[PDB]
Write a protein that binds this ligand. Sequence first.
Ligand SMILES: *SCCNC(=O)CCNC(=O)[C@H](O)C(C)(C)COP(*)(=O)O
Ligand SMILES: *SCCNC(=O)CCNC(=O)[C@H](O)C(C)(C)COP(*)(=O)O
Lengths: 82, 581, 581, 82, 82
Amino acid sequence: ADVMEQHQEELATIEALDAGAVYTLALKTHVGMSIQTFRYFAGWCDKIQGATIPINQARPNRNLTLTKKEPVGVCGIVIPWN
Amino acid sequence: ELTEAELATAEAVRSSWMRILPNVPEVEDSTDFFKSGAASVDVVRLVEEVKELCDGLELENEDVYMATTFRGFIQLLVRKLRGVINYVEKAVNKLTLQMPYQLFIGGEFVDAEGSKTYNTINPTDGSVICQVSLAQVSDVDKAVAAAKEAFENGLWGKINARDRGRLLYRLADVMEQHQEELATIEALDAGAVYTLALKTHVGMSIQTFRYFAGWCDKIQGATIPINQARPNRNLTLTKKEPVGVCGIVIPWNYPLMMLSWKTAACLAAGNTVVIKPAQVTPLTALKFAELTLKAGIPKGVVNILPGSGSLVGQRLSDHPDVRKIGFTGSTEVGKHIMKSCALSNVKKVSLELGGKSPLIIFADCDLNKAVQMGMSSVFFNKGENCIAAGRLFVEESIHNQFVQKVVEEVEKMKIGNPLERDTNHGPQNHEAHLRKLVEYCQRGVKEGATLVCGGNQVPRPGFFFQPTVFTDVEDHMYIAKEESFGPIMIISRFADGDVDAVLSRANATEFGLASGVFTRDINKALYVSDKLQAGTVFINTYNKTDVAAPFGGFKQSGFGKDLGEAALNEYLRIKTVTFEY
Amino acid sequence: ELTEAELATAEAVRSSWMRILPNVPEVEDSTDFFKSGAASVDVVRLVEEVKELCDGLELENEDVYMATTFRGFIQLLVRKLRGVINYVEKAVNKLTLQMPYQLFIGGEFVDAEGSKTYNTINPTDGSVICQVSLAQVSDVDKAVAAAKEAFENGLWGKINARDRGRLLYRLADVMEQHQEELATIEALDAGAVYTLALKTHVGMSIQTFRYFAGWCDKIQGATIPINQARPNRNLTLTKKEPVGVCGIVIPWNYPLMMLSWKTAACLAAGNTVVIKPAQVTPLTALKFAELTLKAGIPKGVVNILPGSGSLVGQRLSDHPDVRKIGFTGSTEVGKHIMKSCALSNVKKVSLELGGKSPLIIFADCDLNKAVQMGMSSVFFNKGENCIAAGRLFVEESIHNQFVQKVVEEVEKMKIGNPLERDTNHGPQNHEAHLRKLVEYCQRGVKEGATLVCGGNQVPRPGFFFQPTVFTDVEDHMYIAKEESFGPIMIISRFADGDVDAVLSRANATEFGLASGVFTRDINKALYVSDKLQAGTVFINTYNKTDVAAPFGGFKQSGFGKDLGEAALNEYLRIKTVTFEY
Amino acid sequence: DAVLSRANATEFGLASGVFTRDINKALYVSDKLQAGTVFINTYNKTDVAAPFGGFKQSGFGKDLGEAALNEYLRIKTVTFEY
Amino acid sequence: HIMKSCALSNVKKVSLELGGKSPLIIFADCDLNKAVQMGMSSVFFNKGENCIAAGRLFVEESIHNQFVQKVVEEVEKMKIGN
Ligand SMILES: *SCCNC(=O)CCNC(=O)[C@H](O)C(C)(C)COP(*)(=O)O
Ligand SMILES: *SCCNC(=O)CCNC(=O)[C@H](O)C(C)(C)COP(*)(=O)O
């Protein structure tokens, strides 16, 4: 995001030539929310908590249960043109 | 003793165990069921097998977990095959009541040290309605011991969270069956109107237990993603465990509701509890204790000790076994609880020390709706409400119009016997409080506030009080600053289109529990909702709390919520297990 | 008609309304209760007032919300003052059953288009146990219409979340009263053993509804802190709304349990539902539909349509009113549901398409515990389990010892009538399935699987199958790759102290629903738990799911969880309201 | 109700809006509008933290906010006994 | 066609944002001057190319003629070019 912030005037220009988005809007929206998005989700990375569930103990034997939030693997993203 | 018929069944039960359990080389007297290797399916395969041998029987899975050994099982099976509470009767509201008048320590009604009692007052008549047992320091230590026994050694701690819920849900269904009974007791003990008692006092009590019962088995922890000590792996997780023993103290304005609000939260977390009901209103709590036995709550979970606040309440804060207090009442008494909490064993504390709730009213409002809500803010449950509308900041464009409507509607409000359905405004609680409200209104007029209507006692048997109104009230006055804690509407003018000016006046108060604002204009509503320094803001309504909605103080009103998901996090603690591999 | 006695009470009810409501200039026939200005306290003050006039009455708050106008109220009050299901009887297991044999569309048992029926089979005997109504395309559209009517127009949508919970909790308590009945029907219809049916099939069904009932009024959204358009303020919040109509399709392995797992989640979210029970096992679902009336579920909420999968199941995916499908069964049929979901109205989909679940066993393990869990992994509910242990990767140090113990314990396992408590292993479901299992074991021996024991039909009246075992099983073989869906233990050797090697073999599978690993060594356990590509890993246990614990596929096993908090997020949708001020 | 009948009469329904001072109308209309991203006295006021997605034919599965992660994650469920 | 191929392959997950048709109700209670700029900034935002673009504008009959007449003036002001 900080690298995209340094090249934000560059990306805003490329948006205007490629897409046709207005340079003023490109900084606030097209590049601005792009920077914000990466800054946001970067934050999430190490707060993606699971859960320890309280479940029926097979009495008198004890039973711990928990959830791990794992990644799926490979993501095939397709994006629009707008 | 073991007869011939019992030996025939005993050998068939031994023959079952051989077939049920996997290896089991010999089923000895000493041999255990679960140690051998038995899943929870084998517990049901056992019980159903015995129900073929014995016709009636009536056996459940609970007793199998208790009686693990063969000696214990056969002793239990044979026992049942071959094998009283003191009330105060009163026929009122077409119902023969059965109010307990004693302590409640470990699922057993017992007298105090030396059978020391005191009178509990009926504010409808004025006469006494039975003598209640006054709790002593010796009795407190038995209750805390019974609580600690129930938590550590007892059944409460062992059983599942889902089980605690199933019990707590039945407790609500038991309270639902005796809801007309509890509603009657509320009217006699507290003075709450019977119609309101069903909807609020008993209604939200039922809802509360039904709610928190639900939570029991959904109190999830968290597996944290943390810095792996590479290349070694590191799993981390949190368990939400119960604290232990909870020393709840409740106010007098709502006997049964405030009990439920705190109790149900503790019991859902998985805590044993030592409730301290208000001296002037114990009978609802003692009746609630009777119901715990019928619901099937283990004995020692709930403990109830009616008595003086300084005697009982102070011992709970000192006693080091208790790890949680949840006080709610006066500010000067409430700070003395938190002081003793420090000099004891650093126990957790949650406070709801009254308030002084503002209620802004703009010209954008409907007016006709502002009146009924303006009354139902102040004059609700005989005025006795912790979130009672303190000051009513009404706009100058509709001050004269608003007040004139209220005065008409105040005269309509029926006053009388709280059992009767005609009555809207009921009588106050203890007399000690009534005399304070008279001096409060006297002081209001003496300071310089225009008494519109009310402001004095009604000459009639009972401890009734007239719905009072005050107009032309400056911020410097006494009644503006200090809370009434009664049916006293305190109206204040403010200039037309002055949003920040009235907010400055409204927030200018060290107490700030709840607040409100009536308006159509969404820009004002949502703006004022942010600026008002109060934990429970209302918009186009008032006294619209819910068991799911959290509720708590900000400034001197206190900290630590009650009701909702937040309520549990007080009465729970968070263990943090960490592995490496 | 309105007599003299009724007019006397009617004018007293008019006299009440005048006193209850604030302004009310005239109480006309047309005049409404709530429009005038009435809080929820006034609803209770009304009902209790009428119970003074009329002695018996038996009035509740529900009917006041329905009958708002004075005409509607007096018509309703007078109506009650002055003012049959076709079963199949069968006396078995000391209980006279009452199994419905028809459809269930809008709280009403009705026949199909032309009274088209089919035989449902009892696998204990082999003979038929009554004819069941075969659902058609014309009937499906009535059910979806009844669902859409119930959601949009009906009572289900209007009432509170807390109310939906109170109904769903009573549904569990009603299912608890008829738990011995449901357990019997399971044994006749499915062939699940009566002892297991109480603990699992009916037991978890009860637990499930009790659980999700709890959730109803705790399905919290979120107020997001977002970029304020300074100096203008911006409030943002999320509402968790219900989707609408849910087209659930369930498998045959668990008739009542898999129904509850999906149904209870939908109903807790606040959805009307159109269940499609399995053709071969409908009777439990139809019996469940009878109980919804007793519980007091509004008519149109639950809809049940027994019939062919291609006829009924395919129409639900096409029909645009339905906004959610929750299929569980075979892969080739389940993929065809998701295909039709796309070419319709991009409706949501959740899948649980089998699972070739591995189960590693190390030398560190106890061995005696590994056997009973090794059996209870594979041989559980007549072998018919979606999380049944496919391959058992047992270590070479204790392969010969482990197998030799199993062979002894397999011979002990009682086989016979599932109603009788002696029986451990019950008979299979439909006969079509039995013949496939015979070819499966034949194909094993043909491709080179050492039949240790079992692997053929039992000479007996009924559709029984011997507990099978296979040893010396390579990864290239058929039985190793493809799932059995039956009581067939498939053991595989692996080298001593080869953790990554066996994990490579275990994860080498496109299906991966559940998995397990038995070991004392915590370093192995927690390592293997991470590496195993399966949604429900077990450690020193197996078939230890819970209603609170989430549960779902990863790869071809599918996506979208059932059970737990995650289950709701399928059958909910998240609105995002945003203000500016 | 008449305009809400017309407004919701559409198989596509991603976002929506309503401009009004009257809070009774705003909050009522916010509930009734069948759209995943309702606006009140504003429009095109999304945020990286605020979730955003379709309802009907607009689709399913959110992007932006905490909800976005739950698409691209999977939830393992480890269970012990002791 | 993406979701169809996702079925007959390896039963993978899918999230869709298939355009929309976003309504925008406007009552007489509204400010009007704020409705215009937001009414434009709903539709005419990023060269009109927006998945949450204001489809239909349900404006009230009391302020239909007044609203439209303001928009026409403000549309002519909107600069067009590089
Ligand atoms: S000290 C805690 C004080 N609690 C209350 O005042 C809450 C009592 N209120 C209610 O039970 C409901 O909010 C009532 C007054 C019945 C209104 O709800 P209704 O309009 O559904
Ligand atoms: S297709 C879904 C399959 N579900 C199951 O196999 C879950 C059935 N298991 C149970 O009900 C319990 O986990 C049992 C087997 C009774 C063991 O629990 P107990 O040791 O408390």
